[PDB]
Structures are given as C-alpha cells and as structure tokens.
C-alpha cells in the first residue's frame, strides 16, 4: 500500500545500500538538499555579502582595533558564520545543475567524474562572482562559468 | 646491503616499504601531468619525464 | 594530499586490514570509500558523569516532548468540541456530523504517531551514545550529524583512510596478540578458528 | 606501411670514461624549512643561487646568511576583492546594519 | 490446480497482494533506489513488454 | 594512470586550499583513492578502467 511503514521501511533500507558505482553514489549523495527559487537566491546572496563585509570589517578591527562590546563581537561572529553557511548552502544547492550540464561533455577523453569536479570548481567561481542586483536568475549567470 | 650489484649476493629480503623509505628512494617530486613538449619534443620541466 | 589505502592489503581473499583490525570487509569498504563514518576514539570518565547529567537532559527533553504531545491533545479536544458545535446543532447526517470527529481522531492518531517516531529517534540516539565504542560504524548520516552536534565532546569520528590511519595509530599488537593467545587457549568452535 | 624502428628522443655518444681528472667543483649546502639538509655540487665558477628546489620537493634556501628577501607577489584574487569591485563601503555597511537589525529582532525583538 | 508443485508454492508464497509482490520485485531487482507505486507499475512493463 | 593520479591530487589540493563543502572534498578524495587503486591493480574492485 502507501502506509503502515512497509513501503517506508523498504525506502529506508534501500537508502542504506552499498552502491559500489561511484557515480551512482555521488548522485544519491547530491539528490538530498532542497532546490531553491529566485527569492531564496536573493536572500542567500544578501547574507553572503553581509557575512563577507562583516568578516572583512573584523579583519580590519582585529589588528590595531578595539576591544568591542560583547554583543557586537558576538553578532559579528554570528554574521561571519552565517555567510559561510549560506555559501555552502548555495553550492550544495546548485551541484545538480553542474551535473546536468556536465552530462553532455562525456564520451571523449575525460571521465565523467572529473568533468563533474571541474564543473564544481567553475560553480565555486560563479557563486563568488554572482551579483543579485541585476535581477537575473542564478543559472543564467552560472552556465557561462560552468 | 649492495646497491651496485657486483653479483656477490647471499640474500634477497623483501619488506613492506614505508613513506620514509619512499621519499628516500626518490630524487625529485613530480608535480605536473605533462610528458613532452608538443613542438620541440623535449621532456617537460617537472613532468613525468623531467 | 590525503592518505590512500594500498589495494593488496584491503582486497584479498583474506583481507589483511580486516584481520588486523577485526573488521568485516563489507564494513571496511564502507569506511575507506567514504560510505560510512567510524568512531575512531571515545572518552570514558566524561561519559561516566555526563551519563547522569545528560540523562537528566534527556528526561527534560522528553518531558518537553510529552508536553507538546498533550498540548496537541488539548488542541485536538478544542477543535473536536468546535466540530461538535458545528455538527450537532444543525441539520446534517449523523455519519457526516461524525466524519469530522473521525478525521480529528485519525489526526490525533497520526500526530501521536509522529511524536512516537521522534521519541524513538531520541531514544535511539541516547542509547547509541551510551553504547558508543571504538571501531563502530555509523551509517545513516543524519544520526551521526545529530550525535556530533549534540555531543561534540566525548569522542571523535572520521571517515576514510585518515580514520583507518588513526585506528592503526591507536593500536597495540602485544595485548591484542595476548588476548588472541588466550582465546585459542580456552575457546572452542568457530571463535577458535577465527582467532587462529 | 614501414618497419617498426623506434628511437628514444636522445642521442648516445661514447667518449673516454676517465675519472683521473674532472673540473673543480664546490658543494653548496641547501636547507629547507623542516630541518632538512641537502648538498648540490655546483662547479667552481658558478653563480650559486640563493634558493634552490630541493630533492625533497620543497623550496630550500641556502645555509649562508644571505637573506635575499625576494619580495613575493600579492595573493591573486579574493572573494572580498570581487565583492569590493562591484560594491561600495557604504552599501556594504548598509546591508551590515540591515542584518544587524534582523539578528536583533530575532534575538530580542 | 493439478500441479502439486504449484499448490505447494501457492501455499509457500507467504505474500498476498499485487502491490506486495511489486515492492518485493522492485526492492530485489532495483536495489539502491526507493520504491514508489508508479515505478514498479512501469518497471515490469518496461522490461518485457 | 599516473596522469590521472597527478590531476586528481592537484585538484584536491586546490579544493582544500580554496575551501569547499564536505560533499565535493569527500567525492574528490574517493576519486583519488579509486585512481590509486586502479593504478596498482586495474580491475580488482569494480569495473576495470
């Protein structure tokens, strides 16, 4: 049927399998996080830029700076952590786009997984250089770099 | 024991080689996936043929 | 840039790493190929006293769980009386005026089903933290991440050839061989053949 | 459509293998960072370089106290630099104050 | 009906239900993929028909 | 085989120095491990290269 944990136990026990092929292992790995929309990309980009400016400001005020108030230093570290959390979240969101693009350059010379890894490195560069105020979607910019 | 192989041997000991032996055998660390310059056919610097 | 296991001592007809560390080859392929975490070290005395303090923490958390459970029960009773007021005061079918009653009953049943499932989750992670030991594999990534971000002390655990290198680091051949000599001295049957 | 005749890319000469005299040569002692010593026999009239790429695989310096100070290049590109090339300090400070007010409203409201 | 072998297997079947057979087929033939009631509906009809 | 090991080692070093999430670095390390295993004995574990 659809309940009574028979199908649920079957899906759970089939989730914890070997999958000796490394490509199938990586695909089952990356099919995990939830995909995003343009509003989520806007939110994550704003959080990333805020965290980057906060950690650069803390880098400035670390040497020759100030013993800051405890709340100011604490939420400065909070924004500094939140920026990297958003960056990891964005990269892990668009891994699937890297896979879907790199499925077509196979069959000649290189192996599949090396193409996937080079696409991931291009996606790192695209999420570093992406801008949100130009009002475009993230795949529109990221396809160039990938 | 011997390393110039003067054909005076009495043993041949095998052994499980550690990283301290591996980086003691080697003469230089290869760090580039290149073999030969495509135009002048010379062995590349820091390649597999350096 | 990261250590790598030699293939002759991992995949043989006896697997020599498996016989040395007493691991199953099915488990060894899960460890050294980034399929499953492995507990490489653990504490004893910190676990011994935070056993009491963290079981107090666990009882506090499960008390809050049951508080949210009977709060869901009270909200179900409130919505059930609302269904009573909007059913048994007008003209309707006697089965259709209890259809919302049965829907709220099955809603309470699935709500306590969810609550009992996360109760099982908390009981599982607490029991696993009590029975934590070295050379133990942890499949189900979510359980390991929950265990780590709750109990980042008391143990370390990695995944791969670095973790295998840590296991070979924390290792004595003398007491292991003496235990095996004791087992082939006194034991019997299958365990004697395995110990040989 | 020919004969398989191979040749390695290199010539083989044969001259007199005499060891009774050679060119005179020095020996320079190079040192890496991790307590390693290396000997590289250069010739006598040879401008000995202050650094050297060692046999171990890391850039070792020369054990004589030359102190060359080669003045290495900048780190190429940062995420902060790619942010700063398209934003300004007051706009980044404005978003910083925005996130500060948001974490304040989440913390105590 | 006549086959002693077939009635012995139909008593030793230990599974009742078409979907109950389909989930076993999918979990043994697939394994490493979560089953759903449209995939086993299409997997067998893709393999032999 | 030597070029595959050299490529994946350089890429792993660049990913570690760049700062990448755990998924990419773990997949890269299992890629390097599979490449060295294929160097020492191709066709031992899984599909031969």
The number of helical segments of chain A is 6
Distance between termini of chain A?
43 Å
Kindly estimate the percentage of residues of chain D that lie in beta strands according to DSSP: 5-15%
Total count of strands of chain D: 4
Largest interface: A-F, 19 and 18 residues
Radius of gyration of chain D: 30 Å
Question: Considering DSSP H and I runs of 4 or more, what fraction of the residues of chain D is helical?
Answer: 10-25%
Order of helices and strands of chain D: EEEEHH
Q: How many β-strand stretches of chain A?
A: 0
PDB class: transcription,transferase/dna/antibiotic
Keywords: initiation, transcription bubble, antibiotic, sorangicin, open promoter complex, transcription, TRANSFERASE-DNA-ANTIBIOTIC complex
Entry title: Mycobacterium tuberculosis WT RNAP transcription open promoter complex with Sorangicin
Chain A: RNA polymerase sigma factor SigA
Description:
This is part of a larger assembly, with one copy of chain A (146 residues), three copies of chain B, one copy of chain D (109 residues) and one copy of chain E (49 residues). Chain A has 146 residues and is mainly α. Chain A has helices at 6-15, 22-30, 38-62, 70-102, 112-129, 138-145. Helix content of chain A is 71%, strand content 0%. In chain A, helix 3 (38-62) packs across helix 4 (70-102). Chain A is extended. Chain B has 50 residues and is low in regular secondary structure. Chain B contains one helix and no strands. The longest helix of chain B has 7 residues, at 19-25. Chain D has 109 residues and is α+β, with helices and mostly antiparallel strands. Chain D has two helices and four strands, in the order ββββαα. Chain D has helices at 79-84, 89-107; strands at residues 28-31, 37-40, 51-53, 59-62. Chain D is elongated, with a radius of gyration of 30 Å. With 49 residues, chain E is mainly alpha-helical. The interface between A and D is medium-sized, with 16 and 16 residues. Chain F: This is DNA-directed RNA polymerase subunit beta'. Chain F: Belongs to the RNA polymerase beta' chain family.
């Amino acid at each position: 049927e659809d309940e009574s944990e028979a199908l649920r136990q079957a899906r759970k026990d089939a989730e914890l399998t070997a999958s000796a092929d490394s490509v199938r292992a990586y695909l089952k790995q990356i099919g995990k996080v939830a995909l995003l929309n343009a509003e989520e990309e806007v939110e994550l980009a704003k959080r990333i830029e805020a965290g980057l400016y906060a950690t650069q400001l803390m880098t400035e005020l670390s040497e020759r700076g100030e013993k800051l108030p405890a709340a100011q230093r604490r939420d400065m570290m909070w924004i500094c952590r939140d920026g990297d959390r958003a960056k990891n979240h964005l990269l892990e969101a668009n891994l699937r786009l890297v896979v879907s693009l790199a499925k077509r350059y196979t069959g000649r010379g290189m192996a599949f997984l090396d193409l996937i890894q080079e696409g991931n490195l291009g996606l790192i560069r695209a999420v570093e250089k992406f801008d949100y105020t130009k009002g475009y979607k993230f795949s529109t910019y990221a396809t160039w770099w990938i | 024991g011997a390393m110039l192989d003067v054909n005076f041997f009495d043993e041949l000991r095998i052994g499980l080689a550690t990283a301290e032996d591996i980086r003691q055998w080697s003469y230089g660390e290869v760090k580039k996936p290149e073999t030969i310059n495509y135009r002048t056919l010379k062995p590349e610097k820091d390649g597999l043929f350096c | 840039a990261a250590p790598v296991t030699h293939i002759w001592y991992f995949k043989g007809v006896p697997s020599r790493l498996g016989y040395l560390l007493d691991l199953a080859p099915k488990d060894l392929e899960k460890i050294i190929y980034f399929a499953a975490y492995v507990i490489t070290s653990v504490d004893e005395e910190m676990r011994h006293n935070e056993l009491s303090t963290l079981e107090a923490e666990m009882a506090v958390e499960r008390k809050a769980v049951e508080d949210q459970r009977d709060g869901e029960l009270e909200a179900r009773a409130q919505k059930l009386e609302a269904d009573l007021a909007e059913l048994e005061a007008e003209g309707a079918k006697a089965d259709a005026r209890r259809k919302v009653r049965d829907g709220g009953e099955r809603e309470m049943r699935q709500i306590r089903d969810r609550a009992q499932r996360e109760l099982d989750r908390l009981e599982d992670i607490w029991s696993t933290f009590t029975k934590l030991a070295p050379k133990q594999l942890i499949v189900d990534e979510n359980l390991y991440r929950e265990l780590v971000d709750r109990y980042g002390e008391y143990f370390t655990g990695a995944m791969g050839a670095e973790s295998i290198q840590k296991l070979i680091e924390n290792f004595d051949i003398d007491a292991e061989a003496e235990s095996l000599r004791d087992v082939i001295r006194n034991g019997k049957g299958q365990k004697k053949l395995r110990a040989l | 459509d020919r004969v398989l005749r191979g040749s390695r890319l290199g010539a083989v000469s044969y001259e007199t293998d005499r060891n009774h005299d050679l060119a005179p040569r020095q020996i320079a002692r190079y040192r890496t960072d991790n307590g390693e010593e290396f000997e590289v026999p250069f010739a006598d009239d040879a401008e000995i370089p202050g650094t050297w790429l060692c046999r171990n695989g890391m850039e070792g310096t020369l054990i004589e106290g030359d102190l060359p100070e080669p003045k290495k290049v900048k780190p190429p590109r940062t995420h902060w630099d790619m942010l700063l090339e398209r934003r300004s300090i007051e706009e980044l400070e404005e978003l910083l104050k925005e996130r500060l007010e948001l974490i304040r409203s989440r913390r105590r409201g | 009906g006549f086959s002693e072998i077939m009635r012995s297997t139909l008593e030793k079947d230990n599974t009742v239900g078409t979907d109950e057979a389909l989930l076993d087929i999918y979990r043994k033939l697939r394994p490493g993929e979560p089953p759903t009631k449209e995939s086993a509906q299409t997997l067998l009809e893709n393999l032999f028909f | 085989l030597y070029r595959r090991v050299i490529n994946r080692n350089n890429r792993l070093k660049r990913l570690i120095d760049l700062g990448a999430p755990e998924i990419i670095v773990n997949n890269e390390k299992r890629m390097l491990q599979e490449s060295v295993d294929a160097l020492f004995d191709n066709g031992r574990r899984g599909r031969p290269v």
